[PDB]
Design a protein around this ligand. Structure first.
Ligand SMILES: *[C@@H]1O[C@H](CO)[C@@H](O)[C@H](O)[C@H]1NC(C)=O
Ligand SMILES: *[C@@H]1O[C@H](CO)[C@@H](O)[C@H](O)[C@H]1NC(C)=O
Lengths: 107, 116, 257, 107, 116
């Protein structure tokens, strides 16, 4: 299995700034097998980006991801107060998929 | 239109069995294969396995192989998750996942407080 | 068998249902020359020969008429005038063994020849490198070549087709042991010898054939036909018309002979 | 390298009932390029199933194997008194073939 | 009709060398390539290496590289295996094996126990 250690476990960033989230893979994974997710507290996960380049429905234009191979990046332009939640990166390359250990955005 | 309504909480003694449902409505039941992902309180999400609703093939994970079984009921349009050999550490909220025009997990039911 | 000494099994005097082989999805490639893979159930043949050997996906294309290469030139050469088809399917479960098959060896030659011999030290037989841990185009494949000899003898190997009774003195579309045509079947007084089955006129056209089940000798005469000519006075006089059937008896629709 | 794990080291079953064995892989293996082994005490290992579905010569129909990709399963329908031995799983899809550790059946 | 009789058991000191033979009969030795498998008492099978009996091309295991060497005598239809610098845990029953009518497993030898 691929051990998914999200590097910024706690990020103490203030509202209004720009947020970057890292996601490294032990083995090189196909970019078309990636989706990044956000679970707002008490509410089910939402598909932000699928296919590593394209955003999905119901997601604001401020949310955008990129990356290829093993280095995967998120760029969020402006933070809204409702957007403060935890984010996961999820890849479906080979056999069983592996979830993230989570990065909590602290104020 | 796509809705999943999971059954209520269960409080079970160790060694018992639990059948948890989540009613499927709004989508063709025997089309998108139903999945099941639970989340321990405070930890991340862990997938158990996926069952196709058309023919019945399954694929289980290491940490729960030998304990889980996956079945489908096409007639009632309800997917049943049966778990035997319950112990204390099985306490988690179990969510069922339907693709919902995404990749795998979307449109989850509120959640089932399986406290053992 | 190895390609240097391929097997030749003789098929004769039986009913061959090819629909099972044609419908089967188990073949990796099924390219037919000569006959269509779906019409082979209707035609009838004298004999079938099965050339069986193992080759590899690389160079496997050489089992086609008139091809060159180490295998096509030194092991098995198909004639340019081939009337038959070659079938191939993946044989990993049976012809691949771990490490290496040296059981199968590969060595120009005339078509359908067979040379099993051995003779700056070089010897003419080389071993095939069957690896199950290699690139896929090198893994052994089982190939069976069906070579068909047509017209060579009375037809004996053909598919499951239900027969009917025979109707005389009408042009009917018949199929006698793979020979198809249209004409009127009547009795004849041509005494064929017991071993001869069909007769041909000048420029390869059948005049008689011997039927199976009743062994009579029927002459085949094409049904009456001819041009239609129009006798007309002219659009400036009348719409009356006459029809001339050139030198044929119109016993099948005033009439002047 | 592809590692093998069989979940039941020993299964204690009365003769007559249903037994199941597991043996999964870490990286995907072609179904055709597979076999299964039964090694009697004090005798050489014997191929029960090869090709992950096909029996060998002299194998009773009570045995059968199945599975493809990474997860593989061996089926024994009726347990006879002589059947109680150790069973090995082996894949040879790419490069080095890897054998199993064995599973013992107890009366 | 096919029978393979290997050499007798060996007892040796750590660091030394050992050679094990296996005579073959009833088949074309050159036609089928030979295979070697190790099995420690209580542990599983581990494949050791390959050497074709036609040309002699080589494919060794990385773990055992620099210590194992197989050679074959075509005239006497006999296969050899040279192993130098043995350690304690390498005490195992050593089989020679050719695949016949099977992809692998055919003709495992009676085994040779080398005790180090
Ligand atoms: C019409 O027919 C008459 C005699 O039948 C002929 O003389 C004349 O040429 C015809 N006219 C045309 C246009 O053909
Ligand atoms: C055509 O006319 C009649 C009609 O049956 C036939 O008897 C006659 O012989 C035919 N003519 C010739 C020249 O054979």
């Amino acid at each position: 299995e691929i051990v998914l250690t999200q590097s910024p476990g706690t990020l103490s960033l203030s509202p209004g700034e720009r947020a970057t989230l890292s996601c490294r893979a032990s083995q090189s994974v196909s970019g078309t097998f990636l989706a990044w997710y956000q679970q707002k507290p008490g509410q089910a996960p939402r598909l932000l980006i699928s296919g590593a380049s394209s955003r999905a429905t119901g997601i604001p234009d401020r949310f955008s991801g990129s990356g290829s191979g093993t280095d995967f990046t998120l760029t969020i332009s402006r933070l809204e107060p409702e957007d403060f939640a935890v984010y996961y990166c999820q890849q479906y390359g080979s056999s069983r998929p592996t979830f993230g250990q989570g990065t909590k955005l602290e104020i | 239109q796509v809705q999943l309504v999971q059954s209520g909480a269960e409080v079970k003694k160790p060694g018992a069995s639990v059948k948890v449902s989540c009613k499927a409505s709004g989508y063709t039941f025997t089309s998108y294969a139903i999945s099941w992902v639970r989340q321990a309180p405070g930890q991340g999400l862990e997938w158990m396995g996926w069952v196709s609703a058309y023919n019945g093939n399954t694929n289980y994970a290491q940490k729960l192989q030998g304990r889980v079984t996956m079945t489908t009921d096409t007639s009632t349009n309800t997917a049943y998750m049966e778990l035997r050999s319950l112990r204390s550490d099985d306490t988690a909220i179990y969510y069922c996942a339907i693709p919902y025009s995404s990749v795998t997990f979307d449109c989850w039911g509120q959640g089932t407080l399986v406290t053992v | 068998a190895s390609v240097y000494a391929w097997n030749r099994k003789r098929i004769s005097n039986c009913v061959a249902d090819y629909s099972v082989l044609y419908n089967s999805a188990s073949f990796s490639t099924f390219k037919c020359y000569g006959v269509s893979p779906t019409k082979l159930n209707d035609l009838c043949f004298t004999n079938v020969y099965a050339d069986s050997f193992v080759i590899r996906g690389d160079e496997v294309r050489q089992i086609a008429p008139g091809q060159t290469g180490k295998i096509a030139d030194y092991n098995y050469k198909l004639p340019d005038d081939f009337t038959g088809c070659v079938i191939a399917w993946n044989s990993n479960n049976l012809d691949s063994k771990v490490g290496g098959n040296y059981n199968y060896l590969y060595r120009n030659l005339k078509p359908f020849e067979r040379d099993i011999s051995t003779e700056n030290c070089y010897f003419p037989l080389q071993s095939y490198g069957f690896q199950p841990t290699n690139g896929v185009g090198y893994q052994p494949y089982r190939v069976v070549v069906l070579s068909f000899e047509l017209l060579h003898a009375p037809a004996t190997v053909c598919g499951p087709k239900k027969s009917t009774n025979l109707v005389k003195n009408k042009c009917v579309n018949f199929n006698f042991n793979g020979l198809t045509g249209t004409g009127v079947l009547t009795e004849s007084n041509k005494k064929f010898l017991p071993f001869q089955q069909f007769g041909r006129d000048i420029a390869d056209t059948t005049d008689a054939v011997r039927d199976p089940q009743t062994l009579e000798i029927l002459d085949i005469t094409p049904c009456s036909f001819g041009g239609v000519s129009v006798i007309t006075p002219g659009t400036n006089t009348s719409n009356q018309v006459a029809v001339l059937y050139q030198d044929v008896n119109c016993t099948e629709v005033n009439v002047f002979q």
